[PDB]
Each structure stands twice: as C-alpha cells, then as structure tokens.
Design an enzyme around this catalytic site. Structure first.
Site, PDB file in Angstrom:
ATOM      1  CG  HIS A   1      -4.637  -4.804  -2.578  1.00 33.89           C
ATOM      2  ND1 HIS A   1      -3.715  -3.902  -2.081  1.00 33.89           N
ATOM      3  CD2 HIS A   1      -5.813  -4.505  -1.976  1.00 33.89           C
ATOM      4  CE1 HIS A   1      -4.305  -3.106  -1.209  1.00 33.89           C
ATOM      5  NE2 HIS A   1      -5.578  -3.450  -1.125  1.00 33.89           N
TER       6      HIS A   1
ATOM      7  NE  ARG B   1     -10.102  -5.018   5.186  1.00 31.55           N
ATOM      8  CZ  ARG B   1      -9.025  -4.294   4.901  1.00 31.55           C
ATOM      9  NH1 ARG B   1      -9.155  -3.015   4.570  1.00 31.55           N
ATOM     10  NH2 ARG B   1      -7.822  -4.849   4.921  1.00 31.55           N
TER      11      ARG B   1
ATOM     12  CG  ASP C   1      -5.144  -0.215  -1.542  1.00 32.64           C
ATOM     13  OD1 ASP C   1      -5.893  -0.621  -2.450  1.00 32.64           O
ATOM     14  OD2 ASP C   1      -5.462  -0.348  -0.329  1.00 32.64           O
TER      15      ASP C   1
ATOM     16  CG  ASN D   1      -9.343  -2.323  -1.457  1.00 31.27           C
ATOM     17  OD1 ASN D   1      -8.143  -1.964  -1.348  1.00 31.27           O
ATOM     18  ND2 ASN D   1     -10.270  -2.018  -0.552  1.00 31.27           N
ATOM     19  CG  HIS D   2      -8.347   2.010  -1.849  1.00 28.61           C
ATOM     20  ND1 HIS D   2      -8.852   3.139  -1.243  1.00 28.61           N
ATOM     21  CD2 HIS D   2      -8.280   1.064  -0.878  1.00 28.61           C
ATOM     22  CE1 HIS D   2      -9.077   2.887   0.036  1.00 28.61           C
ATOM     23  NE2 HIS D   2      -8.739   1.634   0.285  1.00 28.61           N
TER      24      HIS D   2
ATOM     25  CG  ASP E   1      -9.060   6.408  -2.776  1.00 31.15           C
ATOM     26  OD1 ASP E   1      -9.033   7.316  -3.647  1.00 31.15           O
ATOM     27  OD2 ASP E   1      -9.945   5.529  -2.739  1.00 31.15           O
ATOM     28  NE  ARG E   2      -8.841   6.173   4.273  1.00 33.05           N
ATOM     29  CZ  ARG E   2      -9.737   6.615   5.147  1.00 33.05           C
ATOM     30  NH1 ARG E   2      -9.905   7.924   5.325  1.00 33.05           N
ATOM     31  NH2 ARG E   2     -10.456   5.752   5.845  1.00 33.05           N
TER      32      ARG E   2
ATOM     33  CG  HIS F   1      -6.741  -5.221   1.554  1.00 33.68           C
ATOM     34  ND1 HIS F   1      -7.373  -4.193   0.884  1.00 33.68           N
ATOM     35  CD2 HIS F   1      -7.721  -5.952   2.138  1.00 33.68           C
ATOM     36  CE1 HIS F   1      -8.679  -4.314   1.039  1.00 33.68           C
ATOM     37  NE2 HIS F   1      -8.917  -5.376   1.795  1.00 33.68           N
TER      38      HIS F   1
ATOM     39  CG  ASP G   1      -2.201  -0.721   0.947  1.00 35.32           C
ATOM     40  OD1 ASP G   1      -2.189  -1.940   0.668  1.00 35.32           O
ATOM     41  OD2 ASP G   1      -3.237  -0.042   1.025  1.00 35.32           O
TER      42      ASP G   1
ATOM     43  CG  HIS H   1      -3.627   3.794   0.579  1.00 36.85           C
ATOM     44  ND1 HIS H   1      -4.779   3.655  -0.162  1.00 36.85           N
ATOM     45  CD2 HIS H   1      -3.535   2.680   1.345  1.00 36.85           C
ATOM     46  CE1 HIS H   1      -5.368   2.515   0.154  1.00 36.85           C
ATOM     47  NE2 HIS H   1      -4.634   1.900   1.066  1.00 36.85           N
TER      48      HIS H   1
HETATM   49 MN   LIG Z   1      -6.796  -2.280   0.168  1.00 39.00          MN
HETATM   50 MN   LIG Z   2      -5.271  -0.270   1.627  1.00 35.82          MN
END
Ligand SMILES: [Mn+2]
Ligand SMILES: [Mn+2]
Lengths: 288, 582, 421, 7
Positions: A162, A209, A80, A112-113, A83-84, A236, A52, A54
């Site tokens: 991931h 989740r 990933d 997944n992002h 995001d964030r 992840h 990750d 991000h």
């Molecule tokens: Mn993830």
């Molecule tokens: Mn993540």
C-alpha cells in the site's frame, strides 16, 4: 455453510449491509484464513491489481465492470477499503466476504487506513455507529485488519504494497520477520510500508504526511535489484490519472477511487498482469 | 365510549409535543362526534379557528380535516360555520397550507345553498380578495370559479370586478395567483365576458413587468383558446401569443416552443400556416440555444400536422431553410435534438425530395463529431428506411458506425453495441459479413470487460436475428480462435460466447464444432479458465442429448473434481449435481 | 439646508472593553422602517421596534435570537464562523415578519411573530372524566417568538458576502468570492448558479466578486462588484446563464491603485435609476445609462491618501465599508475611522462629517460637525490625522427608508440619530 | 486537500 456467503455476497452486491451477528462471524472465518498468510503473500498471475477503494462502493462496482467480476477474474487489492467514502461498511465487507469465499481468487492487503486510530478520525468509525448504534462492528473489523498481509509478491517479481519503502527494511525476509498482528505503529518498518511516498528528491526524506518516509529513485532501484524485483506496485497516494509511473518505472502508483471523496476529481485505474506477467492499465471514471 | 381517552385527545391539542398535537388533529372526527354537533359548532370550532398557529404538518392537516366536517357540523344548513377557521388558515404564509384551505373551501362550497353561498361564502371571497395581507389576496384567486355559476348576475358582476382587481394587484404573488386561475375561471364565464374581461387581462398579465407572471399567462393560452370559436382567435388570442413568442425573456419564448404543437392543435391549421410558421421560424433561429433546442425537438410533430394542401410546400420552403442551419449549429445539444427526429420528415416529402433535400442533411449530421448526435442518427433507422435506399445510407454511415464502434470512451462503444442487432437486420446478412463483422468480432477482445460482456450477449441476439445457420458461417470460426489468445480474459471470453450460443444454435452445430473446444480447454493452465469450463457444462448440459452427456462429458468433469485447485473442485462436483451425471 | 442630526440613543457597552461576540456586523431597517435589526459576530440577531414625515419614537428591544452557531470540519481543522454577515428583510407577507440571515456558508429564513393569547382548560388537568371540555383562548401578555423556517445550506464553496431578494417576491440570490446562486424562498434543496467566475486553475485567480444586488424593481436585473473595481449589470432575460447583454461599468498604474480600487459595497438607489459604489477612499454614484464613468464621486477621507502605506501595513486598507441611500436618493451615507461617518447631499453638494460617541454628546444634542487637520499642524476644535483611532472604524450604517432616522454601528455600540421634525 | 493524511 457455503450457502450463506453466496447469498451474503449477492446481498452486499446490492449494497445491503450485514447484521452485527453476520459481521462478527465473517470477521472470524476471515482471521483464521489470513493468519495462514505470510507478511509477503505469494501470488501467482494473472491478477488485476487494484489500489485505494476508500468505501466508494458504487465505484467498486464500476471497477468490476472494467476488470470483470470475481472469481472469474483474479484480484489483488492494496488496502484503504474504508474511510472517506460513504459506503466503507458495505465496501470492506464485500471484499472480506469475497476473500473467504474465493480464497485463491482474491488477495487483500493492509492499507494505512485499516487501523484503529485512523478509522476513528476518518469516518469508518462514525459510519459504523451511524449504521449499527454501537462500535462493535468497528471493533470486529479493526481487529481483523491486524491479520491483513502487509505486502505481496506477484510471480516473485512484482512487489505490491500500500505505502512504500522503509529505511529499516532491506530484504523480503525482513518483512516476513515482522510481527504484523498488531495495530499500525506511529514509527517503524511496518508503519513505513503503509505510509511511505515516493518523491523525486534523492534518498530518504521527511514524509509530509507525518508517518513513513519519502524515497527517491535511488532507493527504489536499490531495493528492487537487491530483491530481484522488476517493479514496486503501490497505491496510497491519489494520482489524477489513476496510475502513475515514477522513478524510471521502478515504482508504480495505482489509485482506484475515482473523483476521490466525490471532490478531488481524478481518474481511477487497475493494472492487469496477464498469464505471462504482461502489464496493462485501465483508467476508469466514477460510475454515473 | 368512556370519556377519558377522548378527554386526553382534546388536551393533546394544546400540548407541547407536535406529534401528539398532530395526532389529535387527525382524530378530530372522533372528538367532534363525542361532543354534540352544536358544541362541535360552539366549542371545537372556535378553538380551531383561533390557533391557525403552529407548523406545516399540523396546520396542513387541520385544513384538510375541516374539509370533511360538513355533516359533523350539522349538514349543509350550517356548513358556513366552517368558514372562519378555513378563512384564517387561508391567510397563513405557508403556501402549501393555504393551498389545502382553499381546496377545502372549494369542496364545502358545494354544500352552500345558492343562498348561503351568496350570503356567506361570497363575502369570504371578497374579504380575502380585499385583505390587507397579500397571502389572503392570493388565496382569493382560487375561490372565484367554484361559485361563479351558482349566484345572481349582480354578484357575477362583482366577482368579475374583484378578479380584474386581483389581476392588477401590487404584489407579484397575487398577480401570479390570478394569472394561474384565469384558465379555470374563463371556463365558467359566458363567452361575452370571456371576451370582454378574460381576454384584456390575459393580455395584460401576459405582458407583465414580472417574468414570473408572464409565463403563467402563456399557460392559460391553450385553455383560453378552447373556449372561443375559431373565428375570434386572430384578434383576441393571437395578438398576445404573437408577442409571447417574441418575448424578451428567453424563458417565456422557451415556453412558447415547448408548447408549440399543443398550440397549433388549438389555433387551427389556418392560423398555424398563417402565424405559427413565421414564428416557429424565429424560434429555430433564436439566439438562446435552450429555445432552439426546444424548437428543433418539435419540428417533426409540427410538420406531421400541417394541412395536407400547404404542408409539403412549407416543409420545404419554410422549414428546410432553417434546418440546414440547425445542423451546423455550435451547440451540440441543439444538433443532438434535431438529429433525434429530423428523420420523421421523409414520410412526408417522398423519395425524390428525401434524396435531394433530406439526404444532404441526414448525411451531414451522421458525420458529426458529437457521438450523441450520430448516435441518434442511427437510433431512427426504420424511421426512414421504408422510404429510401438502405445502401444509399450504408455508404454514408460507413465510418459513423465504425467510429462509434471504436471510441476511446468505452461508454460510447457500449452505446452502439446496443444497436447493432437492429442495424443488422436492416442491412442484410452479407453487408454485415463483408463489413460490420470485423467490428462485432473486435469487441470480444476489448480491454473493458463490460464491452466484451456486452458484445458477447450481443452475438446471441445477432443470430435470433440471422438464423442459427449463419452462426456457423461467419461467427463460431472466430469465437474458437479466441481460445488461442494468450490472455485468460480474452480466452474466458470464448467460453462465455458458447454458454450463450448454445441457447440458440441447434444441438447440431452446438455439439458439432462448439463442444469440441470446451473439452479441450479443460486442460488450460489457468484455474480461472478451468472452472469456467466446468461451469460451461453445467450450463450447456441440458441442450445436449443424454447420449453425448455420458460419452466424454462426465469423464472430464470427474477429472476436474480431481484438481488440486479449490475453486475447480466445487464447480466440477457442484456441476455434476445439475447434469444428472451425479 | 443641512440636516440637523441629533443624538437619540445608544445600545451596548456603557464603556470600553468590547466583547467580540457583541461586535455588530450588519444593520438593516425593515421595509416599513418600524423594525431595526442587527447581526453579531456572536451569531445573534437583535430586532428593535420603534415605540408607538412622521414618528420619532425610541427603538426598543423587540426580539433576540441566536441565528447561527459554529460549525467545524475537524479533518480540515476548519471552523465556519457563526458571525452574521448580512440581514435582508422580506416584504410583509401577513401578520408576521420575515428576514434572511446569512453567515459564510448558510442562509436562514426567520419568522418573527407576535402572540397575545394562550389556551386554557386541561381535562386531565384520576380518570374521573365525567365530561369533556374544549380549551378556550384567553388573552396573555404579548409575546414575540422567532423561528427558523428554511435553511438554505451547502450551496457555497467560498464565503458568502451578499444576499439580495428579487422584486418578484419569490427568489433571491447569494454570492461568494466567485459565485452567485439563485434561490427560491420555498425550495431549500436546490439552487441555480447564475454566475461563476472561478478560474479553472485557481493559480490564475485574478479577480473576486465582492458584493451583489438585485434591482429594486426589475425582476431580471442584478449587479456585482469586484476587487478589480468593476460593476457588472446582468440581464437574466438575455440568456439562461446570464452573460449575454452584460454591461460592464468601468472608469478610464500604481500597486496601491489596485488595492484601493476594490469595491466593497454596491447599492441601487431607491429609484433604481442609479447605483452607489464604495471603494477605500470614495463613494461614487453611477447612472445605469452611462457605463464609461460615474456621475458623482465623493471623497470620504482624502487626508488618508498619503497614508496608504501605513494603512496597508496594518491591514486597514482592506477594511470593507458599506454605503447607503436616504429614501429619496438625495443624501448618501458611509463611514470612516475614529467613529466618524460622512454624509453627502447630491443636490447641495455639501458634505458633513460626524462622530459616533456617547461621552461626547447626550440626548437630543445636535451633533457638532467634525474637522480633520494635516499630519503636522493642529487647530481649533479639530482633530489631527495622526490622532485618529484606526481601530474605531464604522463599517455598518443604515438609513430608515422614509425618515431622517439613522442607525450607526461602532465596534461595540449601535447609535440612533435623527433630526427634529 | 481533504486533510495531508490524503486532495
Ligand atoms: Mn493510504
Ligand atoms: Mn489512501
């Protein structure tokens, strides 16, 4: 043509984004390359495997100071990238830019992002307008994300993804069979691969989740032995250490976003697989 | 000009949008110009006086504007017209706006013939000084010194009265205001009053109930002291500065400390050894770590300024006793502050004392956990090598240098690598070899690429500081051994060292034992090692004579171009269009 | 000897059916006593001005403005309520008025000013500009405008429960459940933390800051109370961090003991020589010299002592009551349920008990001291415990700084009571 | 804890 990327990279390296023109085209050259890749991308070692990111761009800089600069060092990222963080744009473009430049030195998988529905609610969406005025550079990316490889096989021994394992997936051919060129479903094997988490409670559990599942050690042991694997390498999930063995070393989690969201305060880590597939981990803190 | 555009600018002053309103404020000269100079005085001014009601930006500009409007109003004969609007603005809550107004007021005060200046400008200062609002009263503090000289003694008498008044104001705002202008005020008073007025109040504020007010006084200390003949000090200045250093507020005391040397160099070498040393002693032993730190980060410069006669005596009878303490301090910022200069002392106590008094400490510091501390103890080498034994040290920083050279925290490691090139020449060539060479060679196989990269580039600067010959002695033999390391990273590290050692090692040694390897590495299984060899050539190419450049340099490069690896072609074909071997 | 409290005004719903946003959550007179402010659950602020010992004119609406608005953290499914927790006025800077208002996360400095004139004279009022003309200020009908001049945000991880200005006319502090931060009234991008009692492992959380105030005169002193029932006096001079020379005020059991031992409010006496404290059942004065026990302890509603269980079952045991002093630190007020509020004279030692009710009393009607019976027996002109409305609590009250005027807030209405002068 | 879709 090459001339531009070398530059584009030098620019993005300084954290200077690209134009809606430039992006829209990079996403093009990218697509054509990524379709020629399998759902289970074959990758020969050595490779420093990363989790990750991000969008915490500055840290992605700190990561290269730990493992080395591309293309000198072969890299495998497990999704990933957006995001964030506050630099999802500059981050995901640097990497997608590197992939096109050094096709054989970098492997980018799908997180997944790297999906539409998520990028909206989690920042990559808003960030996009907040840097372009329109949601076009977000559409060019969310589209390119589709062509991203779901998993990877290093040396035919280490399985890198991931998320995690699926109840509707047993062999690598099941994955290769899958049609990845579509948004991430809410259910199903493709989804699971990108959402699953490994807990310590036997068999398949209900993923807290909302997407994917939770698998216990028994499930991992089976999958690995059934597909002749040594290890399952994934990200992840944030791990305070940066990386964490579980399921008696059948599975390993690698998070590469230190102090996640500048809040979670945790270490980041990359995993080096050398010339002879010997593994080592490198924990790093957020660049100051 | 046509009037429309100006008519607009005028209307703009009374418009909703703040930016338009701000725009016309900025074109006021062109409005005043277009009006008369008597209409500017009878129309534009009244209007700009009322308002004094908007937002920072606008008001802030209006104030600055009015500061340059003396002639636009009709020369010095009418500069007093400017006062009502500036007076108004000096009342505003925003202290950044008040600040401007005052600034402008001071500027145009120098347009006031001692007459006006006395007939209008001084009443201004008093109206402000005696105003219901503490804002107003605060701005008064800054209008005294600009008109003290140019007026009658009856007046100066008054000004001295008001000020003392403002100094006993009910509001901490004003009091602060006062205590801050004290300096520029005493600077316009005749020493008589400067001792009868300025002193009693610099004494009161400096002992105010409000912490905020006290530290402000202690600032003026210096300005005040340099307006009195050295004799007066001990009775006027020192009584205050004495209690300031003993102040209940760790902040005030901290001020004293951070301002210590600036004080000494204004309080005289006598009063220094007299009062400051006993004080400075109290600080180095202050309960508040923040104070101690501030103090300890002065000890050096304070000592380099003691009268020659007593100096060496107090430095060892008065100071040393407190430093033996400041070494075993619990606070690592304190210790870190001391060790960063504790060494500027030796060139003041000579060999013997530096060996039986400074060494036991300088040694006790070097062996401290905190890497920051022992990291400073190494930053200041030359600092004390020119007065003592490099070996009498080299037998103490044995681990210190090692320890840091292998700290878990790679940042720490990068820290010391920055200093090896200096620590090198300051420890001979053999010592490095039979000691510090094992470590400089371990970093090149460090897990962290940054440390490896920083230990590589360190070699280069470890030859320009040791001759291109020593590079062939105890250096390249190992750099070539890394070409055998089973990890392409530790291996690529070898080519990286060459790409750098060629730049400064003479074509002799370069084409001697350094080029034989690069060629052999071209058959490495890992592409990342193969194109990093094709790169090593496009780099080292020029340093080599056109002779060897034809022999086997192009054969290999033309071979690499014939690799099945995409990235290996490019750096072999794009590596030729740079060596002329195109 | 007892103050003759009289009904003067009511503000709010002429009946019941209380609109949540309208529920007053804070009430504070300004330094002169002329302005009276309130704070809404709806985030609004209403300033009332006294019509022009001394004056006893009615307080009339002077300024209304929306101080805070809601905020969300959609990802965390969180809303930061716009409710105004506290209002604290700043001492008169000049012609304008200034106050600080805070909610759970943001403090805002507001400026309330008067304007009695306007500009007149538009040149362009079609390019027939023959002459230029400068606007003239003409008298207009008085107008009061309110504007935010400083937004102190993002300094708090937890819920802000206190804002207190320093005697220095320069800084002020704000406090969470676990942190107090120091601010400069003109710097909005930085805040210095002067207290942090947040346990490293939130699971070992055992105590929480509950209130906090600066000394009225001592620029370097402040106190903060805890859920644990302990005031702590701090000396900012003693150290940069403010933990040294710290004086803990405590008093020499049951599960409930702990619950009603939590201090809800802390208030330095005007003289700054004592400080009042309030916990569930009592108001208790402390001498700043003596920190081993209070000097006075008054019981606000002892008839509830046996009810701790029921009150605990319906949450009322957690209600946080505020308490205040009369200008001369001689009488001391606080509230209870069934719109009753208590008053204790530190001299006389006599205590009153009053009711805030419209349809019960009218203009200049002296208030009829109330009385409460036991859980069984009823009596003459008294009300039984088992007949008290625990929904009609009185958490916010305020005392004119120099008169026997008093602001009492009920869920919906705001009462103003004063004596005859 | 930043919101279980993941601290
Ligand atoms: Mn993830
Ligand atoms: Mn993540």
């Amino acid at each position: 043509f090459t001339k531009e990327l070398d530059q584009w990279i030098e620019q993005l390296n300084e954290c200077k984004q690209l134009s809606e023109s430039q992006v829209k085209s990079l996403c093009e050259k990218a697509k054509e390359i990524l379709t020629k890749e399998s759902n289970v991308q074959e990758v020969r070692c050595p490779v420093t495997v990363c989790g990750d990111v991000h969008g915490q761009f500055h840290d992605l800089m700190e990561l290269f100071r730990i493992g080395g600069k591309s293309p000198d060092t072969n890299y495998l990222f497990m999704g990933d990238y957006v995001d964030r963080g506050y630099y999802s744009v500059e981050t995901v473009t640097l990497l997608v830019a590197l992939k096109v430049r050094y096709r054989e030195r970098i492997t980018i998988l799908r997180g997944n992002h790297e999906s539409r529905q998520i990028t909206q609610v989690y920042g990559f969406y808003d960030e996009c307008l907040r840097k372009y005025g329109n949601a076009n550079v977000w559409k060019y990316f969310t589209d390119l994300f589709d062509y991203l490889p779901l998993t990877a096989l290093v040396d035919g021994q280490i399985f890198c993804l991931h998320g995690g394992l699926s109840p509707s997936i047993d062999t690598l051919d099941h994955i290769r069979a899958l049609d990845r060129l579509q948004e991430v479903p809410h259910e199903g094997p493709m989804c699971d691969l990108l959402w699953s988490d490994p807990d310590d409670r036997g068999g398949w559990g209900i993923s807290p989740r909302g997407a994917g599942y939770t698998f216990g050690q028994d499930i991992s042991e089976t999958f690995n032995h059934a597909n002749g694997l040594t290890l399952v390498s994934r990200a992840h999930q944030l791990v305070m250490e940066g990386y964490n063995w579980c399921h008696d070393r059948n599975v390993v989690t690698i998070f590469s976003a230190p102090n996640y969201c500048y809040r979670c305060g945790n270490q980041a880590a990359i995993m080096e697989l050398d010339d002879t597939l010997k593994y080592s981990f490198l924990q790093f803190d957020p660049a100051p | 000009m046509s009037l429309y555009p100006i008519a607009v600018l005028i209307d703009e002053l009374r418009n909703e949008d703040v930016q338009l309103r701000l725009n016309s404020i900025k074109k006021l000269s062109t409005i005043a110009l277009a009006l008369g100079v008597e209409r500017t005085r009878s129309e534009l001014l009244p209007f700009l006086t009322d308002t004094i009601y908007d937002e920072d930006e606008v008001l802030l500009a209006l104030a600055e504007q009015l500061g340059t409007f003396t002639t636009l109003v009709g020369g010095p004969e009418y500069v007093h017209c400017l006062l009502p609007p500036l007076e108004s603005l000096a009342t505003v809550e925003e202290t950044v706006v008040r600040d401007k107004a005052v600034e402008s007021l001071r500027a145009i005060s120098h347009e006031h013939s001692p007459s006006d200046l006395e007939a209008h400008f001084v009443p201004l200062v008093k109206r402000l000084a005696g105003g219901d609002w503490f804002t107003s009263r605060t701005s008064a503090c800054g209008l005294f010194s600009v008109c003290y000289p140019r007026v009658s003694s009856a007046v100066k008498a008054e000004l001295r009265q008001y000020f003392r008044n403002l100094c006993s104001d009910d509001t901490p705002m004003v009091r602060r205001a006062a205590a801050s202008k004290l300096g520029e005020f005493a600077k316009v008073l005749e020493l008589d009053n400067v001792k009868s007025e300025i002193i009693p109040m610099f004494s009161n504020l400096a002992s105010d109930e409000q912490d905020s007010v006290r530290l402000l006084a202690v600032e003026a200390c210096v300005n005040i002291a340099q307006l009195l003949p050295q004799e007066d000090l001990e009775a006027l200045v020192m009584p205050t500065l004495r209690q300031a250093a003993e102040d209940k507020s760790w902040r005030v005391r901290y001020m004293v400390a951070d301002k210590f040397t600036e004080l000494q160099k204004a309080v005289g070498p006598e009063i220094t050894k007299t009062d400051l040393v006993p004080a400075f002693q109290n600080l180095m032993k202050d309960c508040e770590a923040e104070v101690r730190a501030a103090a300890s980060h002065k000890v050096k410069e304070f000592c380099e300024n003691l009268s020659a006669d007593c100096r060496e005596n107090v430095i060892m009878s008065q100071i040393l006793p407190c430093i033996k303490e400041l070494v075993s301090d619990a606070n690592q910022h304190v210790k870190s502050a001391l060790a960063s200069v504790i060494m500027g002392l030796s060139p003041i106590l000579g060999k013997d004392n530096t060996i039986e008094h400074l060494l036991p400490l300088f040694l006790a510091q070097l062996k401290d956990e905190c890497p920051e501390v022992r990291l400073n103890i190494i930053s200041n080498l030359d600092c004390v090598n020119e007065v003592i034994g490099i070996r009498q040290l080299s037998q103490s920083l044995l681990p210190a240098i090692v320890e840091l050279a292998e700290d878990a925290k790679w940042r720490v490691r990068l820290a010391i690598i920055e200093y090896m090139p200096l620590l090198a020449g300051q420890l001979g060539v053999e010592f490095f070899d039979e000691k510090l060479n094992s470590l400089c060679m371990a970093w090149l196989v460090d897990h962290v690429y940054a440390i490896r990269e920083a230990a590589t580039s360190n070699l280069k600067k470890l030859v320009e500081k040791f001759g291109k010959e020593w590079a062939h002695a105890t250096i390249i033999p190992k750099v070539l051994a890394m070409s055998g390391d089973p990890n392409y990273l530790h291996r690529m590290t070898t080519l990286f060292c060459i790409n750098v050692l060629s730049e400064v090692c003479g074509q002799d040694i370069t084409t001697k034992h350094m080029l034989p390897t690069v060629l052999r590495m071209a058959g490495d299984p890992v592409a990342n090692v193969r194109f990093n060899v094709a790169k090593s050539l496009q780099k080292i190419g020029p340093i080599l004579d056109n002779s060897t450049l034809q022999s086997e340099v192009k054969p290999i490069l033309e071979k690499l171009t014939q690799d099945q690896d995409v990235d290996v072609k490019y750096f072999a074909q794009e590596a030729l269009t740079v060596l002329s071997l195109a | 000897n007892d103050i003759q409290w009289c009904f003067s005004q009511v503000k709010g719903a002429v009946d019941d059916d209380v609109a949540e946003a309208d529920i007053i959550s804070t009430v504070e007179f300004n330094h002169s006593g002329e302005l009276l402010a309130t704070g809404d659950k709806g985030g609004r602020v209403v300033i009332f001005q006294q019509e022009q010992s001394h004056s006893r004119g009615e307080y009339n609406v002077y300024s209304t403005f929306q101080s805070h608005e809601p905020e969300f953290d959609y990802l965390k499914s969180l809303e930061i309520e716009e409710k105004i927790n506290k209002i604290r006025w700043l001492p008169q800077k000049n012609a304008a008025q200034f106050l600080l208002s805070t909610n759970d996360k943001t403090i805002k400095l507001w400026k309330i000013s008067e304007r009695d004139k306007r500009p007149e004279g538009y040149n362009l009022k079609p390019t027939t500009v023959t002459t230029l003309r400068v606007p003239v200020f003409r008298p207009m009908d008085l107008m009061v405008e309110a504007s935010p001049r400083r937004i102190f945000a993002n300094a708090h991880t937890y819920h802000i429960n206190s804002i207190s200005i320093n005697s220095d006319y320069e800084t002020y502090l704000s406090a969470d459940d676990l942190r107090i931060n120091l601010w400069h009234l003109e710097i909005t991008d930085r805040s210095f933390n002067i207290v942090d009692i947040k346990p490293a492992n939130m699971e070992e959380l055992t105590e929480v800051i509950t209130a906090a105030e600066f000394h009225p005169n001592s620029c370097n002193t402040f106190v903060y109370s805890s859920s644990k029932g302990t005031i702590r006096l701090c000396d900012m001079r003693a150290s940069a961090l403010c933990d040294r020379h710290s004086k803990l005020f405590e008093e020499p059991r049951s599960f409930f003991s702990e619950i009603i031992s939590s201090i809800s409010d802390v208030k330095f006496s005007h003289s700054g020589r004592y400080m009042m404290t309030r916990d569930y059942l009592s108001v208790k004065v402390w001498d700043l010299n003596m920190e081993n026990r209070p000097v006075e302890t008054y019981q606000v509603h002892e008839y509830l002592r046996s009810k701790l269980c029921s009150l605990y079952e319906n949450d009322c045991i957690f209600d946080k009551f505020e308490c205040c002093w009369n200008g001369s630190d001689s009488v001391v007020m606080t509230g209870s349920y069934n719109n009753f509020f208590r008053m204790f004279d530190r001299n006389t030692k006599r205590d009153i008990t009053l009711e805030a009710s419209r349809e019960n009393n009218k203009p200049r009607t002296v208030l009829k001291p109330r009385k409460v019976c036991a859980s069984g027996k009823r009596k003459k002109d008294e009300i039984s415990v088992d007949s008290l409305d625990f929904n009609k609590k009185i958490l916010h009250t305020a005392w004119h700084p120099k008169e026997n005027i008093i602001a009492v807030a009920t869920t919906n209405n705001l009462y103003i009571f004063q004596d005859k002068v | 804890x930043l919101x279980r879709x993941x601290x």
